[PDB]
Amino acid sequence: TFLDTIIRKFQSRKFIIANARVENCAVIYCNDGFCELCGYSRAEVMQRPCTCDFLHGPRTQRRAAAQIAQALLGAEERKVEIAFYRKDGSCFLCLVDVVPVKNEDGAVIMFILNFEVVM
């Protein structure tokens, strides 16, 4: 469990960790700050694609979602601003920070995604 080593990254941080070795980059961890941010519980978040489609609503731009998808096929850190929706229906502007995690060979094996509310 080196995932716990990564989990060590955990001040009001809101992030998820994704398994890049399955086709949809399923969520294999989400911290309490993230669940609290979006109003969904850990159980409602786990195993979903890390694109967080479940946070999509009317104001979510196709283009911003597309940037995140492209990032998840790359190997560089990327920052995308996107409109997300909490479980209660409220919309928050979000800066998503996609961070690739690599192995000794330099292959991407995970992503960490951090989320920050934007004004």
Author numbering: 13 to 22, 25 to 133
Paper text:
The KCNH family of voltage gated potassium channels includes the EAG (ether-a-go-go) channels, the ERG (eag related gene) channels and the ELK (eag like K+) channels; these channels have roles in cardiac repolarization, neuronal excitability, cell differentiation and tumor growth. A defining characteristic of KCNH channels is their large N- and C-terminal cytoplasmic regions. As already stated, the role of PAS domains in KCNH channels is unknown; it is not known if these domains bind small ligands or mediate interactions between the channel and other proteins.
Based on these observations we generated a construct of the hERG PAS domain that started at residue 10, the Δ9-hERG PAS; this protein was crystallized and we solved its structure at 2.12 Å resolution. While the body of the domain in the Δ9-hERG PAS is identical to the full-length PAS structure, with a main-chain atom rmsd of 0.74 Å (residues 26–135), the N-terminus adopts a new conformation, with residues 13 to 22 forming a helix that packs against the hydrophobic patch on the domain. Some of the amino acid side-chains in this N-terminal helix are not well defined in the electron-density; similarly, two residues (E23 and G24) in the linker connecting the helix to the first β-strand of the domain are not defined and it is therefore not possible to determine if the N-terminal helix packs against its own domain or is swapped with a neighbor in the crystal lattice. Interestingly, a superposition of the dELK structure with the Δ9-hERG PAS domain through residues in their β-sheet reveals that the N-terminal helices occupy the same relative positions at the center of the hydrophobic patch of each domain. Interestingly, the crystal structures show a conformation, with the helix packed against the hydrophobic patch on the β-sheet, which is different from the one in the NMR structures. In the LOV-HTH DNA binding protein the N-terminal helix packs on the β-sheet, side-by-side with the C-terminal DNA binding domain, and in the LOV2 domain of the blue light sensor phototropin 1 a small N-terminal helical extension packs against the sheet together with a long C-terminal helix. It is therefore conceivable that in some functional state of the full-length channel the N-terminal helix of PAS adopts the conformation seen in the structures of dELK and Δ9-hERG PAS.
